[model samples]
Target: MKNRIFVSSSKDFEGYPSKAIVPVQFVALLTSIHLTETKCLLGFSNFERRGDQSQEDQYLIKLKFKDRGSERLARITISLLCQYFDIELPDLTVILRDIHLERLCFSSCKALYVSKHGNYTLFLEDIKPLDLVSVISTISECDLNNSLVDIFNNLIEMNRDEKNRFKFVKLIHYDIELKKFVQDQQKVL
Candidate 1:
């Protein structure tokens, strides 16, 4: 089972316009969307994930999906969310393009480009475990060793091309590798 870390609204504290400015990147799976209640949240934890648990000791900030309490379950985009919570993003020149997760099968997923106000998101399917790690490793800029990252990384870089880049500098390029990696993870499964 996967541990779903739950977080609350990080409304106000510093008190200028009243909200936090989180620099950490947060990955939100599809489950974060609670349509029944029309709610969602975004946050990140740096501590070791024990699976199906939350350790408050580790630093984490959860931001509610705008609207605060009275009507939080409204339409939101990455840009709108940032403005609502005063959350600054790593995006400036060109924000992320909408990535396509249309493939319901192991070998099918691809990235997308939403031209007008294209806001992309981190969607996790069954193979999300490793993809999450990959994103984190990509951001932190370190070599990863794991089920999908590098237990498969010994005597490497020979037969295949090392197409994966250090930065997700270009969203499509990164997802291209992630699709390859995500599919590769399924072979042994």
Candidate 2:
């Protein structure tokens, strides 16, 4: 059975003033959203935006799903929870903390944070996790080893042709490779 993680939040979108300054990239098939009387619950792989080039860090990591959190305590809290659930992500505090200090408000499961201000305006985006197994499995199936750094580097190195190959090579390959790896391990026992 697939492991499941649950998080709850109150039904208030407080401090949510405006849309995100940069586009909020929601990973497909990696999140689930639900509403209850007092909260919003959502689950996703990871949510991020690159630094606007003008910034020194080259990235302002607002939300990362891994263990350590950055400028926002709420984001750190979420990261802690994700770690307890064995949810995975990249190390981002190095870059995230270098950017301007930001605030993340977590009143509901729909985690929100402000990216920038427009006088009275505040930009907010939802925090979600990526499909943990899928990401790792997809990378592993391509013979890339099970390291986030390696996976990212491989992804970055992809060109148009390689990216097209990723579509056809990932999921099914993982299943077959995983089954064999398990069998091989069993034989070792």
Candidate 3:
């Protein structure tokens, strides 16, 4: 059985004021939504990054999204979440675009675009275990590891390329290779 992660939202879309500045990046987008309780639940993730010189740290942000929430409203919540990271984007511009996850298979999935107001937007997709495994298997088979990012780069790339389909094989390989190296070192010891 595949491992499943569940997260519930404690809050929903809160809009930014017309006079307030907006954000360019969507912070800590989580994998689940819809909450009837006081506080929402998020998946357990231990990934954290910190810098010595900057004292900046990386942690996951779990934002709440409510039904009927508009893009303008969502931006407000996103901005608050960025504050959790102890960073703020003063000039960073955020534009909310409506994208329908027409695929019933991805009905509950939420995405964020992080980029300059108009120049670039980062697409974020948080896939579950089964989905990720399916992706890894597809990408490693066709020998197109060169453009590995093609999968996450765009929806079109995953549709047309064989090896670029899953795109996370390199990450899987990293784990596997590290395991092998550790085993070899243990043997030597």
Candidate 4:
């Protein structure tokens, strides 16, 4: 990996919120790389809680990108941010705020770090990218039975695995039979 650099401000425009969780000299990196913007939706699902003793539910990761390529850049930025913390904990959850929500202290930006030593829960929302746009877009607006049962089923089967588990993230733990769609479609596709 390249040496990590920090980006605390947006050079082109002053006072922009460029402060990041890890060493993301992200703004500079954005300038150095060539990117094309296109509209896209970014989402992520991870295990979370409704309350004490409640079951863990899937929480979607948020993305704040001006366009598709920008979203990709955001993902790279977040991956590196997690890398910074990865040095210590080795396992951290970086959550990005929903762009549609009001801004607050680190609400727009937060990083949750759970220690291997105890029950520590950190609620963090860091900006990142959703890399699998092409594959996600492969099936658009199809019937629920066909799309969920066939296309999504196969996609999850292909990606939901050990390799999907990475250093900066945790494997999403989902209920086996949460929905008829997820259950019936688990291995169908």
| Top-lDDT candidate index | 2
Q: Write model 3 residue lDDT over 15-47, tens digit each, in one string.
A: 222232222222222322222223222221111
Query: Which regions in candidate 1 have their CA more than 4 angstroms from the true location?
Result: 1-22, 35-39, 42-73, 76-189
CA shift at 112, candidate 1, in angstroms? 27
TM-score to true structure, per model: 0.23, 0.24, 0.22, 0.20
lDDT of each: 0.27, 0.30, 0.28, 0.28
Highest TM-score scorer: 2
Model 2 scores worst on lDDT over the 10 consecutive residues at 98-107
Q: Residue 15 of candidate 4: its Cα lDDT?
A: 30
Error of 1 at 18 (Å): 18
Per-residue lDDT tens digits for candidate 4, residues 1-189, read 234333222221133223322322221000011112432222222212123232111222234357555676655655564343231112322333321111100111233322333322222244432222222233332322232233244334334544432211222222222233333435454
lDDT of 2 by residue, 69-108 (tens): 3335544554564453343435542112211111111111
* Candidate 2 TM-score versus the reference: 0.24
Error of 1 at 151 (Å): 13
Ranking by TM-score: 2, 1, 3, 4
Q: Distance (Å) between predicted and true CA of 170, model 2?
A: 19
